[PDB]
Amino acid sequence: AQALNTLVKQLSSNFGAISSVLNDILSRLDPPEAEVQIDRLITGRLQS
Amino acid sequence: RCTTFDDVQAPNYTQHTSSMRGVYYPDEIFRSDTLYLTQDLFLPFYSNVTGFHTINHTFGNPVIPFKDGIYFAATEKSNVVRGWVFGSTMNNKSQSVIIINNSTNVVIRACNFELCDNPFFAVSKPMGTQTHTMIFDNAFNCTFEYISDAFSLDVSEKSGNFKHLREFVFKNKDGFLYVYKGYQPIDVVRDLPSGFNTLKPIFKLPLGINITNFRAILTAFSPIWGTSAAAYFVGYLKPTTFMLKYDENGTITDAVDCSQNPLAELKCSVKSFEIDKGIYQTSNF
Amino acid sequence: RVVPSGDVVRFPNITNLCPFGEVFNATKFPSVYAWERKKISNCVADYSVLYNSTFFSTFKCYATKLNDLCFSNVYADSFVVKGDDVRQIAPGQTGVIADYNYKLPDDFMGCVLAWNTRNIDATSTGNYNYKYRYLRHGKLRPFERDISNVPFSPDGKPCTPPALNCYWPLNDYGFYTTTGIGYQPYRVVVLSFETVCGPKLSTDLIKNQCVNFNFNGLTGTGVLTPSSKRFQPFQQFGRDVSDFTDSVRDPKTSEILDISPCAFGGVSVITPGTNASSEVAVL
Numbered sequence: 001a002q003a004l005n006t007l008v009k010q011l012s013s014n015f016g017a018i019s020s021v022l023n024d025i026l027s028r029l030d031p032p033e034a035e036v037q038i039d040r041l042i043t044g045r046l047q048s
Numbered sequence: 049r050c051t052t053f054d055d056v057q058a059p060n061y062t063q064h065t066s067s068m069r070g071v072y073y074p075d076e077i078f079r080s081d082t083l084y085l086t087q088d089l090f091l092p093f094y095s096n097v098t099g100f101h102t103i104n105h106t107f108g109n110p111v112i113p114f115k116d117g118i119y120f121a122a123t124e125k126s127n128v129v130r131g132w133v134f135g136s137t138m139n140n141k142s143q144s145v146i147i148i149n150n151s152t153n154v155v156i157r158a159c160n161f162e163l164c165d166n167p168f169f170a171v172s173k174p175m176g177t178q179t180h181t182m183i184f185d186n187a188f189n190c191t192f193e194y195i196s197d198a199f200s201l202d203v204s205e206k207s208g209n210f211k212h213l214r215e216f217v218f219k220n221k222d223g224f225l226y227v228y229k230g231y232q233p234i235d236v237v238r239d240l241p242s243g244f245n246t247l248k249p250i251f252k253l254p255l256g257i258n259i260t261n262f263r264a265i266l267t268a269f270s271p272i273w274g275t276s277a278a279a280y281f282v283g284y285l286k287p288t289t290f291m292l293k294y295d296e297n298g299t300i301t302d303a304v305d306c307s308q309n310p311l312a313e314l315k316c317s318v319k320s321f322e323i324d325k326g327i328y329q330t331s332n333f
Numbered sequence: 334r335v336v337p338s339g340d341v342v343r344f345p346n347i348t349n350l351c352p353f354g355e356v357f358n359a360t361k362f363p364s365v366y367a368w369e370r371k372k373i374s375n376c377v378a379d380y381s382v383l384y385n386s387t388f389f390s391t392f393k394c395y396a397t398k399l400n401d402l403c404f405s406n407v408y409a410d411s412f413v414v415k416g417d418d419v420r421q422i423a424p425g426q427t428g429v430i431a432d433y434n435y436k437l438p439d440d441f442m443g444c445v446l447a448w449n450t451r452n453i454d455a456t457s458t459g460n461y462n463y464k465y466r467y468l469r470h471g472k473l474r475p476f477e478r479d480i481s482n483v484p485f486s487p488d489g490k491p492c493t494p495p496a497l498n499c500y501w502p503l504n505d506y507g508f509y510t511t512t513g514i515g516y517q518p519y520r521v522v523v524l525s526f527e528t529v530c531g532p533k534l535s536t537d538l539i540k541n542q543c544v545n546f547n548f549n550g551l552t553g554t555g556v557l558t559p560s561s562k563r564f565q566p567f568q569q570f571g572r573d574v575s576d577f578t579d580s581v582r583d584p585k586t587s588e589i590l591d592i593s594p595c596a597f598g599g600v601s602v603i604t605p606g607t608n609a610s611s612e613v614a615v616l
């Protein structure tokens with residue numbers, strides 16, 4: 001239960017982006033504002 | 049018309065421990081079968097409050113600090129506290145908000161009002177109807193005006209016990225004043241009943257004033273105006289951590305403050321009411 | 334992955350692209366502490382008319398934030414700043430405009446539209462009659478107006494002008510024609526983002542299919558079907574035991590729905606060997 005929920009709650013970590021949501025960073029921000037913070041949340045979630 | 053009274057006394061300052069007050073729905077999220085931990089601007093449990101026994105010569109509404117938000121309670125028999133001036137200077141010098149319930153509508157405006165030195169409802173005492181909103185005389189450089197949908201409230205002087213308990217929470221955010229409403233029937237002799245009661249969202253109010261003080265507009269009662277019996281409080285919203293137990297219908301059924309005592313700081317770590325016997329690591333000092 | 338089939342666009346009742354003279358047509362803009370409020374409600378707006386005018390020259394949104402619109406009322410805020418105070422019209426960012434004159438909300442964020450008024454709203458002695466707050470006993474919260482036409486007490490004590498060592502709350506900008514761009518008066522419309530919706534149409538509830546969906550405050554792909562969840566009337570949508578939304582009250586017809594994601598998973602291949610055969614069966 002813990003190792004799934006710790007894997008769950010680290011979805012919601014910002015990792016230095018303006019949010020932990022890849023589709024807000026996709027849609028709401030600029031395309032230069034996107035790829036800066038897309039590349040943050042992947043490298044965060046990948047090694048999580 | 050800016051008029052005064054014959055006598056304005058100080059309340060009885062009767063102390064009370066607010067047990068389970070201040071709870072509301074923060075969000076619009078439905079959740080069920082769950083147990084959710086959050087901070088928001090909450091009234092804390094077991095909070096020492098003071099009883100503002102307004103009785104027939106006592107009239108407590110000076111400049112009262114708001115600063116982020118306040119909790120309000122009122123056991124009511126005569127339905128006295130029905131208005132609130134919000135603002136900073138409490139004079140005709142800065143932009144203020146007069147929220148009144150004038151027994152027909154909720155009238156809310158955001159202006160630089162000609163604020164009187166006495167915020168009251170000029171209401172005839174043996175029958176309970178308002179002659180004039182003697183809080184402002186007129187208004188200047190407004191930003192907002194609204195009248196709610198119509199109903200009626202009996203606001204004459206009543207005797208016996210308090211039959212009406214209204215729960216109010218006011219907060220400044222993004223221009224939007226959020227005013228939330230709670231209610232239960234009561235049968236109340238003294239300061240406050242213990243028990244649990246939530247609040248629900250009613251108002252989203254882009255008022256745009258610097259909200260740093262409040263003067264809770266009371267109701268004046270005289271057939272030279274007076275008042276009558278009303279027990280109402282002032283509480284303060286603090287950034288404290290709450291548990292939010294949701295039942296199967298999504299009603300908040302109970303809540304636990306984390307910052308009361310080491311028993312309830314443990315509950316927020318376990319995320320339960322049930323805690324087994326032993327020792328549990330909690331956060332560092 | 335199952336590739337979806339259908340669009341679900343559900344909203345309350347639809348109006349057209351309304352003209353907004355408060356966006357691009359106003360000629361004189363007042364002070365910033367007493368910033369003029371005009372609002373936008375119940376119109377499917379793009380605010381392309383911010384660009385489409387001969388009254389403005391900057392065209393920047395705080396500009397992909399132009400389409401940041403499926404929420405409550407937008408407030409087209411009219412005021413003239415200086416070039417050194419163009420920078421402070423921001424969500425937060427507490428300078429002399431944001432901390433005391435005009436603070437911006439931060440759920441969504443609109444567009445700040447300035448215009449070169451060197452020849453109309455300025456003079457060579459400084460058009461000082463436009464003013465701004467620089468120091469006040471109390472900070473603004475977001476989306477507030479300050480109409481205190483009052484001689485100010487700089488520390489909370491009874492020191493009001495015209496007494497000695499008692500300050501005014503208003504400095505002069507310095508709207509000079511003889512200076513550069515940093516001291517010019519700039520007519521600024523700000524769309525304060527705090528009911529309009531940009532991508533607002535109405536399509537069909539394509540139920541029981543892997544679809545796309547766009548709702549009042551809810552986007553995504555998945556499977557749609559009615560739900561039985563006891564929504565409160567003040568509750569828009571539901572979430573699961575995790576933290577993504579799986580239930581929604583319909584923006585158009587208030588039918589309580591479920592949102593399951595689309596089906597997906599892994600693939601195996603069951604083969605008996607190339608020496609054995611050349612047929613496979615997949616799982």
Ligand SMILES: *[C@@H]1O[C@H](CO)[C@@H](O[C@@H]2O[C@H](CO)[C@@H](O[C@@H]3O[C@H](CO)[C@@H](O)[C@H](O)[C@@H]3O)[C@H](O)[C@H]2NC(C)=O)[C@H](O)[C@H]1NC(C)=O
Pocket residue numbers: 295296297563
């Ligand atoms: C969530 O709210 C719903 C109401 O929308 C609750 O459902 C209703 O609950 C009451 C009380 O348990 C049920 O009444 C009972 O009826 C039986 C059948 O005759 C009777 O023997 C009992 O003495 C009682 O009166 C009512 O039937 C039920 N509604 C339906 C449609 O079944 C529900 O209980 C709430 N959730 C929770 C967790 O309480």
Ligand SMILES: *[C@@H]1O[C@H](CO)[C@@H](O)[C@H](O)[C@H]1NC(C)=O
Pocket residue numbers: 063096097
């Ligand atoms: C609450 O504060 C008041 C201060 O006026 C004090 O007299 C009272 O004893 C306090 N309540 C408790 C339960 O200590």
Ligand SMILES: *[C@@H]1O[C@H](CO)[C@@H](O)[C@H](O)[C@H]1NC(C)=O
Pocket residue numbers: 608
């Ligand atoms: C394929 O399987 C048969 C089974 O007896 C074996 O004799 C043969 O050597 C296999 N083929 C190769 C290339 O090894």
